[PDB]
Amino acid sequence: ASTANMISQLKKLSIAEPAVAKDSHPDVNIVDLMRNYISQELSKISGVDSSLIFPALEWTNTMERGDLLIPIPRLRIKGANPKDLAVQWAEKFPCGDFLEKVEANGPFIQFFFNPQFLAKLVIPDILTRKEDYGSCKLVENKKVIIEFSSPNIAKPFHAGHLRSTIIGGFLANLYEKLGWEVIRMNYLGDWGKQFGLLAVGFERYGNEEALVKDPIHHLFDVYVRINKDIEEEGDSIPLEQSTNGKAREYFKRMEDGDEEALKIWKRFREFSIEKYIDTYARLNIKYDVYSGESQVSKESMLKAIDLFKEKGLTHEDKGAVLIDLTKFNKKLGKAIVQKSDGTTLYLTRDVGAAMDRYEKYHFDKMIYVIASQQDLHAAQFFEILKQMGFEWAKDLQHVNFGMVQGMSTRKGTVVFLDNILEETKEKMHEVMKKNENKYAQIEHPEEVADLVGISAVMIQDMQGKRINNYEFKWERMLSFEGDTGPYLQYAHSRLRSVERNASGITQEKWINADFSLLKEPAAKLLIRLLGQYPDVLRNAIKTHEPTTVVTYLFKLTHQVSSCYDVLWVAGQTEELATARLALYGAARQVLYNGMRLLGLTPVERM
Template sequence: MAACSFRRSIASQLSKVLDLPPENLIKSISAVPVSKKRQVADFQLSIASVTEDSSRNCLAQDPQLQAQKLAERLKCDAVVSEISAGPGTVNFTINRELLAKAVLQQVLKDGSEYGVKSELFSTVPRQKAVIEFSSPNIAKKFHIGHLRSTIVGNFIANLKVALGHEVTRINYLGDWGMQFGLLGVGFQRFGNKEKLKSSPLQHLFEVYVQINKAAEDENTKELAKDFFRKLEEHDEQTLSLWKQFRDLSIEEYIRIYKRLGVRFDEYSGESFYQEKSQEVLKMLEDKGLLQKTTKGTGIVDLSEKKDLSSFSTVMRSDGTSLYITRDLAAAIDRMNKHSWDTMIYVTDKSQSNHFQQLFQILKLMGYDWAERCQHVSFGLVQGMKTRRGEVIFLEDVLNEVRSRMLQNMASAKTTKEIEDPMETAEKVGLAALIIQDFRGLLSSDYQFSWDRALQSRGDTGVFLQYTHARLHSLEQMHGNKQLTDVNVACLQEPDAISVLQHLLRYDEVLYRSSQDLQPKHIVSYLLTLRLQKNMSSFSQVEEAVGKKTLAHCSGGSSSSAAFRSL
């Protein structure tokens, strides 16, 4: 692509001066972020990155002087029109006509794969990835953490697919444990079959709340234990009721996830690994890793000195498994089934210790692939409430965002008459939720604000979606004519150059997000791209290549992998 060819040209000249292979230099040459205040060069080389590798100590120790001396030894050519020194950097300005022609032609040539074909990804092997995300607990509150897990996991899966990886998306439901003993007894006492069929998540939650209030009674506790014991023993009637809870809940989840544009390849759950977890306990025992406490619980010593200063409990005193035991069984089973290269768990940061212990036990068991397991954690969100009060289910969030967006659309003077305002309101509202969530580091907590998220102006998902739709409208309006020539003389004004410079950075942004799995790089890129497209840059690019191409390069193909990721 254009950025790659420019990097290669710069690296080729640098390699002769620094006596380093060009391939060692390419990743040290980065596109310069655009600036509102001043014109900037197109690429820069960090002096620190080359002096660490350089075998020739030909440069001075001061970074500014180092940059100056290196810049003096380089020459402009047909590609590079200007070379200058910055604070610890050497800056390269590309021939302006070549920049415009190369970028636009590359955008048109690569289409939706613009940025993906970059040399930056040449050393990144295509992989099989298993991603576990969302994972709500049946009959319990679908809290904001599950919503965040859903959209973050979906982003990671979409990004990996856009970059050519093979992805399996798993929703690992909390569908086993003593809470189902309580739920079973609660349904026998408070349940309604009609309500269960019409609104399973809501009704099971109501039943669970009611039975929890009664759970202080010892008789209720014993009944719950007895129900769960029957469940573990596969009592036909008990298992049938549990299966009904699970199946109806999954049907409801699928319907709600469809509204979000999220899908899963597998609906798994703790219940799948009830028996396999016993096999894991046997393996731990055979390897001498399972120890018993005086109370009869099973633990694995995780301390370096083997003094039990750090350990994980993997078995109850009655011999039954725990959450981590079932996670161990699930990890082993997924490797056997999918032969994955990487497995990613997307949960809130409160579970960081759980996953550290999980990966450590897998290593102790001799599974070297545990090194390729990863926990992507995220912070907490405060303030997510509907007008009716605290958020209980994901559907409450979706209904709220649609309702508020409809109200905003109705009160805005610029809103045009559209065929399906409900659908439009939901899609634009979802973009607003996602962009607000993805603007910062995932690990950071943040205070949610409906008003801020749904603003129609500024750095918001609403305005980003509006810009994207506007550009696609231009594309549709002007047909699918093939570009025959580019009048680059129309693209020499600062505004037009800024858009072209920004497009140069797209592969670096994708690469950075692919490395740390943070969506904020792509969100920041898209918001900045939107800001670059003021009316003067619109008119210049339209004059050069036609409105159809503007939509293609600025809002369609060049950002399509980013939009697919989000």
């Protein structure tokens, strides 16, 4: 067809400058196909280079304004009224089978895609590629190391630890979906006096048979108990001659390689990782490596010392060595790299770890998912690596996030993650029981309840931008009405239920449905929404925000739910039921894809 010929042409077209065109994939992103069509046709009309038009096309804030629009003033056409050009260019714009309409509105031109055209390409594509619908592959292998969660092995997970964990998990899924090779790394805080305190504390209150049940638990009590011994004694008996002192020594003792002090280390660490594996799996996360501050090689450490001098970065003061970053950035200030007693610090270890990682992986990019509470820390060791001469220093990125507020150890207002998950699970289980008929159709009610509960906990956290702080509130986790995780699960479940009720019409028939039977307003809106998923993923890797995907999932499910009320699959002609099944089936697949990307587990019944 002429239309068939154009599609082939457009899918092979590269109009935007290589810089941006490199991200244009009309073959797997319908909106990029439309960007090509619109840029090409508007160029013929305006006389403006299509590569200048392409980046000026923006997605709209609301569907009432079209699918794409262009602000005329953005083309910088001197001596011309933007409003008039909009009217002139829109009036003669060829729609073909691509566009339903083109409209001038103030200094803008709105482009409305033809939904029937979209349905014919998008629906079969979603049903065929399924989980790969909005994905992409790279011409050349790119490897990224994403470090997330990274708790200190000495403490249980509280509401706060959830953040780095799911943000990193999301980013890992997103990068893999878009072609990258991803290394999921957990940088355990398993070194420093922090750990040297557990050593002595365990020798003091360590209970063999007790450490059997649960490591992190017993080890926590010991830490709590030992911290009081050095917090109650006060500044009375000399540090080392007391307790806290004979703890700093055990650390430097561990640095010397004291087989005994190290054997206990490898024990607490190994016991924590085994437990971690199950905890992270519950959140659909499997790390490739459980690294740690203890894993920094001596070579890198020594090399870092040499570079600090070779570059004249460090200078002695107060008996300790630090780096004055003020020369490079006023904000960075001064940072200590070696304590008076010659021991390494958190910052010193990060520099050496970055060096080991590059040597072992030769990454093209490395992302640290760390709280903004550590913005300065990250900004300092990033700069240091830069001034050290490393070319790859520029490939490091800090993805921060805000705090979960309402937590306090010295107040006991802290809420543990396991208790949150368990409580949310029980609440969702309760809601599940209210519908006797539906409940009786679930094989593992308890397990389904946990998946719904976790979706509630993750979504409440990912709804706003990462940078935002948010106070812990049980209602945030327990709510199920409105824009919540359970809302996404319910949408997925009833779409599955609709499919099952019409199991007489297999998915094979859907791809060959008569898509001209999806002309109702509600159907057209849903179709347009389906074609946006690829753009959303692309934008999500740019913002690194789960909310970018979450926001879309709610727009998607809101429309599906609106449609659910007026577009019935059952009790229709075979052809209309097949077409609507195809539309709902495609919507479910996209929801499934997005939910899985975020780290949730879509349920079939609830």
